[PDB]
Each structure stands twice: as C-alpha cells, then as structure tokens.
Design a binder for this molecule. Structure first.
Ligand SMILES: *[C@@H]1O[C@H](CO[C@@H]2O[C@@H](C)[C@@H](O)[C@@H](O)[C@@H]2O)[C@@H](O[C@@H]2O[C@H](CO)[C@@H](O[C@@H]3O[C@H](CO[C@H]4O[C@H](CO)[C@@H](O)[C@H](O)[C@@H]4O)[C@@H](O)[C@H](O[C@H]4O[C@H](CO)[C@@H](O)[C@H](O)[C@@H]4O)[C@@H]3O)[C@H](O)[C@H]2NC(C)=O)[C@H](O)[C@H]1NC(C)=O
Ligand SMILES: *[C@@H]1O[C@H](CO[C@@H]2O[C@@H](C)[C@@H](O)[C@@H](O)[C@@H]2O)[C@@H](O[C@@H]2O[C@H](CO)[C@@H](O[C@@H]3O[C@H](CO[C@H]4O[C@H](CO)[C@@H](O)[C@H](O)[C@@H]4O)[C@@H](O)[C@H](O[C@H]4O[C@H](CO)[C@@H](O)[C@H](O)[C@@H]4O)[C@@H]3O)[C@H](O)[C@H]2NC(C)=O)[C@H](O)[C@H]1NC(C)=O
Ligand SMILES: *[C@@H]1O[C@H](CO)[C@@H](O[C@@H]2O[C@H](CO)[C@@H](O[C@@H]3O[C@H](CO[C@H]4O[C@H](CO)[C@@H](O)[C@H](O)[C@@H]4O)[C@@H](O)[C@H](O[C@H]4O[C@H](CO)[C@@H](O)[C@H](O)[C@@H]4O)[C@@H]3O)[C@H](O)[C@H]2NC(C)=O)[C@H](O)[C@H]1NC(C)=O
Ligand SMILES: *[C@@H]1O[C@H](CO)[C@@H](O[C@@H]2O[C@H](CO)[C@@H](O[C@@H]3O[C@H](CO[C@H]4O[C@H](CO)[C@@H](O)[C@H](O)[C@@H]4O)[C@@H](O)[C@H](O[C@H]4O[C@H](CO)[C@@H](O)[C@H](O)[C@@H]4O)[C@@H]3O)[C@H](O)[C@H]2NC(C)=O)[C@H](O)[C@H]1NC(C)=O
Ligand SMILES: *[C@@H]1O[C@H](CO)[C@@H](O[C@@H]2O[C@H](CO)[C@@H](O[C@@H]3O[C@H](CO[C@H]4O[C@H](CO)[C@@H](O)[C@H](O)[C@@H]4O)[C@@H](O)[C@H](O[C@H]4O[C@H](CO)[C@@H](O)[C@H](O)[C@@H]4O)[C@@H]3O)[C@H](O)[C@H]2NC(C)=O)[C@H](O)[C@H]1NC(C)=O
Ligand SMILES: *[C@@H]1O[C@H](CO)[C@@H](O[C@@H]2O[C@H](CO)[C@@H](O[C@@H]3O[C@H](CO[C@H]4O[C@H](CO)[C@@H](O)[C@H](O)[C@@H]4O)[C@@H](O)[C@H](O[C@H]4O[C@H](CO)[C@@H](O)[C@H](O)[C@@H]4O)[C@@H]3O)[C@H](O)[C@H]2NC(C)=O)[C@H](O)[C@H]1NC(C)=O
Ligand SMILES: *[C@@H]1O[C@H](CO)[C@@H](O[C@@H]2O[C@H](CO)[C@@H](O[C@@H]3O[C@H](CO)[C@@H](O)[C@H](O)[C@@H]3O)[C@H](O)[C@H]2NC(C)=O)[C@H](O)[C@H]1NC(C)=O
Ligand SMILES: *[C@@H]1O[C@H](CO)[C@@H](O[C@@H]2O[C@H](CO)[C@@H](O[C@@H]3O[C@H](CO)[C@@H](O)[C@H](O)[C@@H]3O)[C@H](O)[C@H]2NC(C)=O)[C@H](O)[C@H]1NC(C)=O
Ligand SMILES: *[C@@H]1O[C@H](CO)[C@@H](O)[C@H](O)[C@H]1NC(C)=O
Ligand SMILES: *[C@@H]1O[C@H](CO)[C@@H](O)[C@H](O)[C@H]1NC(C)=O
Lengths: 302, 302
C-alpha cells in the first residue's frame, strides 16, 4: 500500500507502544498526521511539518513523542497506555499534489495480571481427605489470564470473577489426597496470558507430614553365643523429625551389657544365652509414636 | 461552516464557471486542494502551496486557473465546460494542525438552446382553413427549453424530440384562422430556458393577404343639375397592392365630360341630366377583382 502500517496492534497498560508508520512514495511530502477517531470525530494526535516543527494535541500533550525527526517515519511511541486508548488510529500523509491517503491500526488495550502463589491453609498429613495444597492467583488480568499446574499428582480447579473494568481474576486451587511418597514434589502453577512476553511460573515443594517410619537393621541370619561386638540401629524416617526414640525390650526386663549410643544398640559384652528377647525401638514425633521390633535369637552350632 | 462554499452550482457548456471557496479560520493554512470525485476515487484538480507553487492535474492542465494567488481564495474558474464535468467537487483545506475539512458543490451541466423563427410555409390568405403562420425552434437545449407566444390571436402547439446527449429540441408551431383584421400583428415567440440569463425572443409581423376592398366617396346627399366641379374617388385597401382599378359605368355607356385622374373621377363639365347612371370602379390584385358602386342621381329643386 501507499502508506504501510501494521494493523490490529495490542498495547500493554501503563507501558508504552510504538505506532510504526512509513511512507515510501517517490512523492515529495508536505504534512504528516496521526489521528485517533472517536466515532466519526477525528481528534488529531501528532503533526509534523517540514517548516513549522511539531504539534502534540490536548490532552495527548505529554504522552506522545515522535520517534523519527525525518519526514518519513510517522513512527510514534505513545507513552503510558490507559484503557481509553482502545480504538482505531489512522495515519494521514499529505503530499504535493496527490492529496492524502490513510492507513488504520486497531489497538486493543491489554493489562497484565499480577500473580501470586499462596500456601493452602490446612496442613497436609498423610492419607487424609483431599486437601487444598496451594492456591494460584492471577489478579485483575485482561483478558482473563490462564492457569495450569505441572504436578499430575492431584486435581486442578478454579473460580474466576470478572469486573466493571473489563478485567478479571481467576484463582486455581490445587488439591490432592496427600501421601508421604509425594514428599518434596515440585508443584508449580504456570500462568499464561497474552500480555506475558514469556509466561510466568510460581513453584512449591510439598511438605507432607507423616507418622514415623521405623526399621531396625543389625540382626543377620544367626547370632551365636559368644559372638563379639554386634549392633542394632533404630533407623527411622519421619516428618516432622522425631524427638523420642526409646529402645525398649518387649519382655519387660532389660539386661546390662547393653548401651544405646546415638540410636544404635550395642552389645559390648560378648553374646550370652541371655539377650534372647524381642527388641523394639519406639520413635515419636509431632504425629505420634511408631515402632518396630526384631526377634533376637541366640544359638550355638555343633 | 469552517470552509464556506456554495453548493448545487450550475455550469454552462463551452463557457466557464467560478468555483468560489473561502476559508476564514484564524488557523494558519498549509495546503489547498480541489478534488472532483469520480465514484469513491478522488481525482485531484488544483493544489496551492505557500512554498512550492501551484499544480494542475491531468487532464485538467489547460482548463483550470487559480483566481487568487492568496492562501485563502481556493476560488478557481474552470475554463470551457464539457458534459463530463457533471458531478461533486470538494475543496480540501489542510491546516496546521487540525488536519483537514471539506465542503462539496454539485455542478450540473447545462447547455443553451439555439433559437430560430421560421416563416410557416403556406401563405396566409383571408378566411381559410387554419394555417401554420410560424414555427419557433429551440434547438438541442438541456434541459428542454421552453416556449411561449405572445399573440392571443390563434393557437400554440409543439413537438419535442430528445437525444442521447441528454439534450432536446422542441418546435412550437403557431397557427391561426387568418383574418385581414390581423394585418401586421406582432407575433413573437419567447423562449425561456434555465441557461438564459435573460430569456430570448423572436418577432414577426403577420402578412395576411386579402382580396381588394373598395369604397367610393364623393356623392354627398344630392347632386343638382349644373353643380360645378364634383368628384368620385375609388378608395380601396387591398394586399398585395392592386394593379387594375378601372372606372366603368354599369349602364354600358360612358359619356364624355369625365376624366380619371389618379383614381378620382372628375366631372369637369358642370352637371347635366346626363351622367345619371350607377358608377362602379373595379379593383384587382394578386387575389382577384372586387368592386363597389354609387347610384348617382341628378336632381333639381323648386
Ligand atoms: C473429604 O473431602 C470431601 C471434599 O472436600 C474437599 O476438600 C476440602 C479440604 C476442600 O478443599 C474442598 O474444596 C474439597 O471439596 C468431602 O466431601 C464433601 O462433603 C461436603 C458435606 O460435608 C459437601 O458439601 C456440600 O455440597 C453440597 C452440594 O450441593 C449441590 O449443589 C452445589 C452448588 O451449591 C454443587 O456444587 C454440588 O455439586 C451439588 O450438586 C451443598 O449443597 C452443601 O451445602 C450445605 O451447607 C449449606 C450451608 O449454607 C446448607 O445451606 C445446605 O443445606 C447444605 O447442608 C455442602 O456444601 C461436598 O460437596 C462433598 N463432596 C465434595 C466432592 O466436595 C468430605 O466431607 C471429606 N471427607 C470427610 C470429611 O470424611
Ligand atoms: C382545415 O384544417 C384542418 C386542420 O389542419 C391544420 O392546418 C394545416 C395547415 C396544418 O397546420 C395542420 O397541422 C393543422 O392540423 C383540417 O382538418 C384535418 O383533416 C385531416 C384529414 O384531411 C386530419 O388528418 C387525419 O388525422 C387522423 C387522426 O387520427 C387519429 O390519430 C392521430 C394520431 O395518429 C391523432 O393525432 C388524431 O387526434 C386522431 O385521434 C389521421 O389518422 C389521418 O391519417 C390519415 O393519413 C394516413 C397516411 O398514412 C393514413 O394511413 C390514414 O388511414 C389516414 O387516412 C389524417 O392525418 C386532421 O386531423 C383533421 N383535423 C385536425 C384538427 O387536424 C381540414 O382538412 C381543413 N379543412 C379543409 C381542408 O377543408
Ligand atoms: C516507556 O516510557 C517510559 C517513560 O517515558 C519509560 O519509563 C521512564 O524511565 C525514565 C528513566 O528512568 C524516567 O525518567 C527518569 O526520571 C527520574 C526521576 O526524575 C527525578 O525528579 C527529580 C529530579 O530532581 C527528583 O525527584 C529525582 O531526582 C528524580 O529522579 C530520573 O532520576 C532519571 O534520570 C536518569 O537519567 C539521568 C540523565 O543522565 C541520569 O543522570 C540519572 O542517573 C538517571 O539515570 C530519569 O530521567 C521516566 O520517568 C519514566 N517514565 C515513566 C515512569 O512513565 C519506560 O522505560 C518506557 N518503556 C519502554 C519499555 O520503553
Ligand atoms: C479494575 O478493577 C479492579 C477492581 O476494582 C482493580 O483492582 C484493584 O486494584 C487496586 C490497585 O492494584 C487494588 O488496591 C490495592 O490494594 C492494596 C492492598 O493493601 C493491603 O491492605 C489490604 C486491606 O485493604 C489487604 O487486603 C492487602 O492484602 C494488602 O495487605 C494496597 O496496598 C494498594 O495501595 C498501594 O498503592 C498506593 C498508591 O500507590 C500506596 O499508597 C500504598 O502504599 C500501596 O502500595 C492498592 O490500594 C485493589 O485491591 C484491586 N482490587 C482487586 C484486585 O480486587 C484494578 O486495578 C482495575 N484494573 C485496572 C487495569 O485499572
Ligand atoms: C472564459 O474563458 C475563455 C478562455 O479562457 C474566455 O474566452 C477567451 O477570450 C480570450 C480573449 O479574446 C481569448 O484569447 C485571445 O486569443 C486570441 C487569438 O490568439 C491568436 O493566436 C495567434 C497569435 O499569433 C493568431 O492565430 C491570432 O493572432 C490569434 O488572435 C488573441 O488574438 C487575443 O489577444 C488579445 O489580447 C491581446 C493582448 O493585449 C491584444 O493585443 C489583442 O488585441 C487581443 O485583444 C486573446 O489572447 C481566448 O482564446 C478565449 N478562450 C477560449 C476561446 O476558450 C471567455 O471570455 C471566458 N468567459 C467569461 C464569461 O469570462
Ligand atoms: C447532442 O446531440 C445533438 C444531436 O446529434 C447535437 O446536435 C447537432 O449539433 C451539431 C453542431 O451544432 C449540428 O451539426 C451542424 O450542422 C450544421 C448544418 O449545416 C448546414 O447544412 C445542413 C445539411 O447537412 C443543413 O441541414 C443545415 O441547415 C445547414 O444549412 C453545420 O453547418 C455545422 O457545421 C459547422 O461547424 C463546422 C465546424 O466548426 C464548420 O466547419 C462548418 O462550416 C459549420 O460552421 C454542424 O455540422 C447538428 O445539426 C445537430 N443536430 C441536431 C440539432 O439535430 C448536439 O450538438 C449535442 N449537444 C451538445 C451540447 O454537444
Ligand atoms: C530515525 O529514522 C532513520 C531512518 O529510518 C533511522 O536511520 C538509521 O540511519 C542509519 C545511518 O543513516 C542507517 O544505517 C546505515 O547502515 C549502514 C550499513 O551499511 C551504515 O554504513 C550507516 O552508517 C548507517 O548506520 C539505518 O538504515 C537507519 N535506521 C532505520 C531503522 O531506518 C534512525 O536510526 C532514526 N533515528 C533515531 C534517533 O531513532
Ligand atoms: C485576490 O483576492 C483578494 C482577497 O480576496 C482580492 O482583494 C482585493 O484587495 C483589495 C485591496 O487589497 C480590497 O479592497 C480594499 O478596499 C478598500 C476600501 O476601503 C480600499 O481602500 C483598498 O484599496 C482595497 O481596494 C478587497 O477587499 C479585495 N477583494 C476581494 C474580493 O476580497 C483581490 O481582488 C484578488 N485579486 C485578483 C487579481 O483577482
Ligand atoms: C540371664 O540373666 C539373668 C538376669 O535376669 C540371670 O538370672 C541368669 O542366670 C542368666 N542366664 C544365663 C544362661 O546366663
Ligand atoms: C345625354 O347624352 C346623350 C348621349 O348619349 C344625348 O343623346 C342626350 O341628348 C343627352 N340628354 C340630355 C338631357 O342632355
């Protein structure tokens, strides 16, 4: 076309926008205008003369600048978009003598959301009813921002409310039946929105609590009378960390010749036909006490 | 209005026309255009710059001039109208920085007729069937010229044929039962047409022929024997003029003591009891012979 401009542009709230316009005609140029039309009425915006400088109209006076001082780039950046810039703007080029041609660009206003991740309120213990683990918030976005979680470990869901301003807020609530096998999993809501030159992401690790989980190693196949220096450790994974890890013998009695370094159980005396009892360590955290036992047998070969 | 121009103007074929346009705005002016639009396409006509002179477009190049060298009278005379100037022309004023406003004027083409009066072909004798006395011709007028006769002495009538060119010719035939009492009457067709700043008229006198019309004066009440020096003139009005005006006595006989000076009849001898006859002069023209007589009586008192 005689005047080439890109149409259907989109400008971001509060930020600026470059309204490119170029006029490569072997014709000699005498005036250069920009006009936003309110309906059938043409409010002028910017004007460039080769003799009588520039002109910027009220109320655009502060918020428009000419990117090029040449008679050829009608290119202008509109400083600081508001809502009311949503319309059709035409670039009027006056030549001598063809008259004037015009090209239009329709700019739609577009406002960013502001995102937030918020820890769901109830704590996530093991094997309990569905719980809300996290809420992702895309605030006052126009158009409605969009949302998506990457965990495939539970269920998305969202309620979205919209405004007079012709923007909206959606809130995605991520929920799961919590299991300890999901300890420290990365939950992450991505939010995709037109005005996001690169979509924005917010991340989480799951903190699932659970009851203690205990397992004593130490007893290999057979323990023979007089075997010297063998142990039992009360290995246990729990969250929160536990506090109590008492090392009781189920047969109420408890012989000497034992000690409980760390939570290992030492038999610092060589083995006797004593000791022949079912040993049980009992580990306790915020969520309660759990225990495991190893049936200890002392034997002797021919 | 911002730009004041007169609308719905009418331009006369072959002649010129002034397209007035004036732009009294306290705004400073930067370009001045005239554009005839063919449908939705704007062929520029004239352009005025305060720096880079004038411009006249093809093919208007010869036929347009700027009536005012000022930046304020877009007034132009379009030299030599043809048919194809029948349309809407707009005057474009470019200011700095309002942009541009425009006012339109719709010029309809209008061609003069050319008028003629032509003597109807058959001659007008007296008391004959209606005859066509004159034909008035309004030729190739656009729109159809109009016609009217002023004589109230017969009947108008007209046949009007129209053309491709979107002009027409009407021919009014004026007809009457001709009577001699209408000799030398002014018949006149007026032709009224939009393009005639003062309507045009063509005039005629009627030339009605007639048979001769005769009347002898001379005989007063009584003529007495011996009365000295009395005459009879053969007064007669006819058209065409007559040629023969013989002065015969109906009683075949014709005494001496008479003479026919001019067409008076002298009795140069004092009256006798002769002369006592019915005297008749016979007048003859193109249309034939007519006559009148006076019964002459000579008497004598006691
Ligand atoms: C296990 O969790 C189950 C789901 O709970 C979830 O997890 C929690 C932590 C949150 O994250 C929450 O968002 C999750 O949904 C839970 O099962 C649920 O039990 C409750 C009842 O105790 C149900 O709520 C009731 O829902 C009905 C729905 O009625 C219909 O219409 C509504 C629209 O209004 C639709 O949305 C529904 O699909 C239905 O078609 C309500 O009518 C009802 O309202 C009541 O309270 C109002 C108060 O004004 C009264 O006026 C009414 O008369 C009712 O009494 C309840 O809100 C819930 O729907 C149900 N299932 C689900 C899938 O949510 C279960 O309790 C947990 N297991 C336990 C505790 O053992
Ligand atoms: C006295 O003058 C009378 C009128 O003549 C006028 O004066 C002359 C000098 C011219 O200026 C002339 O323009 C004036 O009109 C005259 O009376 C007329 O006599 C003739 C016949 O001798 C009539 O002509 C005939 O008219 C008829 C009309 O028929 C109808 O249709 C036509 C349309 O076609 C209408 O216009 C009429 O109103 C009727 O409704 C014709 O049909 C006819 O055509 C004939 O000739 C063609 C030749 O192809 C044949 O095909 C047909 O068969 C016909 O034979 C005639 O043309 C005339 O109308 C009539 N009256 C008037 C008012 O004109 C009269 O003769 C004179 N007195 C004398 C000579 O003693
Ligand atoms: C879209 O367009 C907008 C604005 O057109 C751009 O954002 C602009 O960013 C500039 C640069 O930061 C802003 O101008 C800055 O103003 C600062 C504040 O001025 C002072 O006012 C008085 C001065 O006495 C005091 O209150 C105080 O000193 C304030 O600072 C200046 O400080 C900045 O000066 C800078 O330049 C000078 C010149 O060398 C340096 O000496 C300084 O170190 C400093 O770098 C500057 O002038 C402007 O206000 C912003 N406009 C806004 C907010 O709308 C966007 O960047 C642009 N967007 C894109 C993507 O292009
Ligand atoms: C179209 O329509 C919607 C709905 O009306 C607008 O959304 C509102 O936007 C404004 C501004 O973004 C929001 O108002 C802000 O509230 C903040 C909350 O402050 C705290 O205290 C409140 C209690 O009242 C708590 O709820 C909250 O958690 C916070 O702890 C204020 O901090 C903001 O004020 C800030 O700016 C001012 C001026 O610069 C400073 O003086 C302050 O110090 C502070 O920094 C502000 O008032 C409002 O909450 C939004 N409503 C929503 C999201 O529902 C959209 O703005 C509008 N869209 C467009 C594009 O204009
Ligand atoms: C609408 O506009 C039209 C034209 O624009 C007007 O009509 C014009 O009338 C002018 C004046 O008569 C015409 O121009 C005249 O041309 C004549 C012919 O030029 C010569 O060409 C060569 C020269 O060597 C020879 O064949 C021969 O000499 C021809 O004459 C000139 O003779 C005229 O000269 C006159 O001015 C000079 C200057 O002083 C005098 O010395 C002379 O004595 C003489 O007066 C003259 O230049 C023009 O052609 C017409 N245009 C046409 C026909 O379209 C209408 O009047 C106007 N209508 C209205 C109502 O405004
Ligand atoms: C739209 O349409 C109509 C219909 O076609 C046009 O009307 C014609 O117009 C032209 C020009 O006016 C007329 O043609 C002229 O004829 C004249 C007649 O000359 C004599 O000889 C003829 C025999 O052929 C006799 O019938 C007649 O009585 C004359 O005795 C010519 O003299 C004209 O030529 C003249 O100009 C040329 C060039 O300048 C010179 O060289 C000559 O010497 C001479 O001066 C001319 O040819 C024609 O008769 C019209 N037809 C009609 C009236 O039915 C309209 O012109 C048109 N309308 C418009 C606005 O353009
Ligand atoms: C205002 O607009 C003009 C014209 O659009 C911009 O012109 C830049 O001018 C330079 C030099 O005149 C052009 O680059 C040339 O590239 C050759 C490489 O062969 C180099 O040798 C020259 O030195 C020169 O750099 C360039 O085409 C042109 N840029 C554009 C986008 O057209 C100018 O940048 C603009 N000014 C401002 C302040 O924005
Ligand atoms: C071109 O257009 C101009 C402006 O329309 C025409 O201006 C004529 O200029 C004269 C003098 O400048 C004006 O008349 C003034 O009248 C007073 C009477 O008080 C007299 O004292 C001055 O000497 C002068 O004559 C007049 O207003 C103006 N005419 C019009 C129609 O506006 C000018 O005539 C045009 N030029 C040509 C060549 O057509
Ligand atoms: C085992 O220890 C107990 C202490 O309760 C002691 O009375 C008993 O004699 C011991 N038995 C053996 C075989 O060492
Ligand atoms: C009248 O004149 C005639 C000539 O024809 C003549 O014979 C006669 O005598 C005259 N009569 C009188 C009274 O004069």
């Amino acid at each position: 076309g005689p005047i080439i401009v890109e149409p259907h542009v989109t400008a971001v709230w509060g930020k600026n926008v470059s309204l490119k316009c170029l006029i490569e005609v072997n014709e000699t140029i005498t005036q250069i205008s920009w006009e936003k039309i309110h309906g059938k009425s043409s409010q002028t915006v910017a004007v460039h003369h080769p003799q009588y400088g520039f002109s910027v109209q009220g109320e655009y006076q502060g918020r428009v600048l000419f990117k090029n001082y040449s008679l050829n780039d009608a290119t202008i950046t509109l400083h600081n978009i508001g809502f009311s810039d949503s319309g059709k703007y035409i670039c009027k080029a006056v030549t001598f003598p063809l008259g004037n041609a015009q090209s239009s660009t329709t700019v739609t206003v577009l406002v960013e959301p502001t995102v937030s991740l918020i820890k769901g309120p109830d704590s996530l213990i093991d094997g309990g009813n569905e719980t809300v683990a996290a809420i992702c918030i895309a605030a006052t976005g126009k158009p409605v921002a969009h949302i998506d979680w990457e965990g495939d470990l539970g269920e998305m869901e969202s309620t979205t409310t919209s405004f007079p301003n012709e923007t909206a807020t959606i809130i995605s609530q991520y929920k799961l039946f919590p299991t300890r096998f999901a300890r420290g999993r990365r939950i992450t809501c991505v939010v995709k929105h037109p005005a996001l030159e690169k979509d924005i992401r917010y991340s989480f690790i799951l903190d699932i609590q659970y009851a203690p989980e205990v397992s004593v190693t130490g007893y290999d196949g057979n323990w023979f009378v007089g075997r010297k220096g063998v142990n039992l450790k009360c290995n246990a994974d729990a969250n929160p960390p536990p506090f109590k890890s008492v090392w009781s013998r189920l047969d109420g009695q408890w012989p000497d010749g034992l000690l409980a370094s760390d939570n290992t159980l030492h038999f610092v005396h060589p083995l006797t036909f004593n000791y022949s009892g079912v040993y049980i360590c009992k580990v306790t955290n915020s969520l309660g006490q759990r225990s495991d036992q190893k049936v200890i047998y002392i034997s002797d070969p021919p």
